[PDB]
């Protein structure tokens, strides 16, 4: 009877950055996905691998809710098989991804005049990320062929660039809060089921 | 008839002293034994001590032996209970009752025991001061419900009446809840039809004797 704590996912006052994206395992509860798509609040809503109609009828063994924050132009990279700064160094969606990605604009709650630079994103890395691999490393990356002993110099930068979220910016650079629901189906009895299955 | 009226309990910090008064009326007092039993808020009854027909037989209970003494003035038909070394746990409402069956106590078996006739809630509050409440509306929005919010008052005995207590139908006064801040919290609600939300004016009369506070608060819709 106890429903899945989706309200503890989207409405959360504090969201993490994207380089350190948060994950809340969802298990042993009842899905009510009708709350998601019966709403005009979500800007980008793209279900990958799952039916657009069987949403409330399915039953997956486990569900993972990956929630973080990026700007308006970076949500196009939250999709299986994409290339880009977020889609290489922060959050990598596998090609066989099976779940629904939910995005909406939050330019009023995650921005403030003068600046709200709490949010970060990984700008540099010497290798692309693997799927679901959370990277929060804090070492000074080296760009050129000239070594760096940690000194923040010409080609030695801190690998986490802050997000400048002000209300008076272009849409592409406004805070969008993202929730990625990952449907895990293992050789085990299901735990997260819908209301009409 | 016979009435064991009591008065003398209040609010006192732990470690001090405070004596209780039980007043006898009607029956012959120097003929019956007298008991003292207390009941905590939400708990059950608990025996305290007892006295004979002034036969010098106290026989107090435990956790109070040396801390309470029973005294009676049979020429005054009044029975007392001297408190001292206040364990803060002693916060309870004390009842004094008659007895006519005890053995080494009152001479001869007359009548039953423990015809309670009790009163006088005795609260051994901590150092925290006696605080008056802050009444807030519980305005409605659209039977229609309507109430007031009695919040942040340390002493418990608060009362409430709606529009000079001539409106007593459909009224629900709730017991208090103890907040985390050591203060109580009470709500009193009345459900009235929507056809009278604009015609008749509703006011809650909150009364708090220990704080000496009385606030008449209106309740107007949003």
């Amino acid at each position: 009877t106890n429903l899945c704590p989706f309200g503890e996912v989207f409405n959360a006052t504090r969201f993490a950055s994207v380089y350190a994206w948060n994950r809340k395992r969802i298990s042993n509860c009842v899905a009510d996905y009708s709350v998601l798509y019966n709403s005009a609040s979500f800007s980008t809503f793209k279900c990958y691998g799952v039916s657009p109609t069987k949403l409330n009828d399915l039953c997956f063994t486990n569900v993972y809710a990956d929630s973080f924050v990026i700007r308006g132009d970076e949500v196009r990279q939250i999709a299986p098989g994409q290339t880009g700064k977020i889609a290489d160094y922060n959050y990598k969606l596998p090609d066989d991804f099976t779940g629904c990605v939910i995005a909406w604009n939050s330019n009023n709650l995650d921005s403030k005049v003068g600046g709200n630079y709490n949010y970060l994103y990984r700008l540099f890395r010497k290798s692309n990320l693997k799927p679901f691999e959370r990277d929060i490393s804090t070492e000074i990356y080296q760009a050129g062929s000239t070594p760096c002993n940690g000194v923040e110099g010409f080609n030695c930068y801190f690998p986490l660039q802050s997000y400048g979220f002000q209300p008076t910016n272009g849409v592409g650079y406004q805070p969008y809060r993202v929730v990625v629901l990952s449907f895990e189906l293992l050789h085990a009895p299901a735990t997260v089921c819908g209301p009409g299955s | 008839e016979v009435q064991l009226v009591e008065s003398g309990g209040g609010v006192v910090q732990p470690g001090r002293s405070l004596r209780l008064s039980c007043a006898a009326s009607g029956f012959t007092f120097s003929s019956y034994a007298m008991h003292w039993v207390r009941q905590a808020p939400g708990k059950g009854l608990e025996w305290v001590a007892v006295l004979s027909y002034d036969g010098s037989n106290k026989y107090n209970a435990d956790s109070v032996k040396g801390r309470f003494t029973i005294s009676r003035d049979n020429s005054k038909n009044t029975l007392y209970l001297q408190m001292n070394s206040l364990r803060v746990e002693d916060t309870a409402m004390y009842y004094c009752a008659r007895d006519g069956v005890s053995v080494t106590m009152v001479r001869g078996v007359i009548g039953p025991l423990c015809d309670y006739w009790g009163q006088g809630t005795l609260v051994t509050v901590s150092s925290a001061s006696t605080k008056g409440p802050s009444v807030f509306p519980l305005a409605p929005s659209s039977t229609a419900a309507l109430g007031c919010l009695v919040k942040d008052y340390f002493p418990e005995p608060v009362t409430v009446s709606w529009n000079s207590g001539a409106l007593t139908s459909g009224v629900h006064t709730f017991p208090a809840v103890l907040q985390s801040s050591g203060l109580y919290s009470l709500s009193s609600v009345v459900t009235v039809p929507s056809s009278s939300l604009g015609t008749q004016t509703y006011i809650c009369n909150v009364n708090h004797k220990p704080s000496n506070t009385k606030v008449d608060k209106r309740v107007e819709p949003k």
Binding site: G7 | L113, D115
Partner: protein, 210 residues
């Protein structure tokens, strides 16, 4: 010193026959007493030394005194009879009571009507937000309330007080008081309290916005 036992938490329809058995501890007690304690009032001696009720009682009560075990019989249950019933022993002077028996008269099931209340703007000046949800005139008291702020349960933020059963209609009434501050009230937008009662099929959610 004894630890007198008693089966509490009784429920019977109007005009029935109920019993309470106070079995004593070591050193078998003779001649217990039976009292009734309605809410807000001092107790009243119903029965004498294990039998022989006093004068004034409506004679619907009785009991039998046999050594270690005792019984308290009520015939012809009354609407104006809901109270708490204690048994007291007196043969060793440290008198000890029973557990007390709350009494609820079985009435036709009542569904609850639920009303919500926002915190007053006057309270917001004190930096506190107290949201109040009402449950009123429902006879089965085993109802649950779960506050859903933005559809997320708030555990450890609410206290609910349940009234004594009413005398005329014999229905309960409880009221939960969700307590917040001005800060965590100003980041959320919708406040509701879901209700589940023995006379409810689907949950009842009364909500409001700020």
């Amino acid at each position: 010193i004894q630890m007198t036992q008693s089966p509490s938490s009784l429920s019977a329809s109007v005009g029935d026959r109920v019993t309470i058995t106070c079995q004593t501890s070591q050193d078998i007690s003779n001649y217990l007493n039976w009292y009734q304690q309605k809410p807000g009032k001092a107790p009243k001696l119903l029965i004498y030394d294990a039998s022989n009720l006093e004068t004034g009682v409506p004679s619907r009560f009785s009991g039998s005194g046999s050594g270690t075990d005792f019984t308290f019989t009520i015939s012809s249950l009354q609407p104006e009879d809901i109270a708490t019933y204690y048994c007291q022993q007196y043969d060793n002077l440290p008198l000890t009571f029973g557990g007390g028996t709350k009494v609820d008269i079985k009435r036709t099931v009542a569904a609850p009507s639920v009303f919500i209340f926002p915190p007053s703007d006057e309270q917001l000046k004190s930096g506190t937000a107290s949201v109040v949800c009402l449950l009123n005139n429902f006879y089965p008291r085993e109802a649950k309330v779960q506050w859903k702020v933005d559809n997320a349960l708030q555990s450890g933020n609410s206290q609910e007080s349940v009234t004594e059963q009413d005398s005329k209609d014999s229905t309960y009434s409880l009221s939960s008081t969700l307590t917040l501050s001005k800060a965590d009230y100003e980041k959320h937008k919708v406040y509701a309290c879901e209700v589940t009662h023995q006379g409810l099929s689907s949950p009842v959610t009364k909500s409001f916005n700020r």
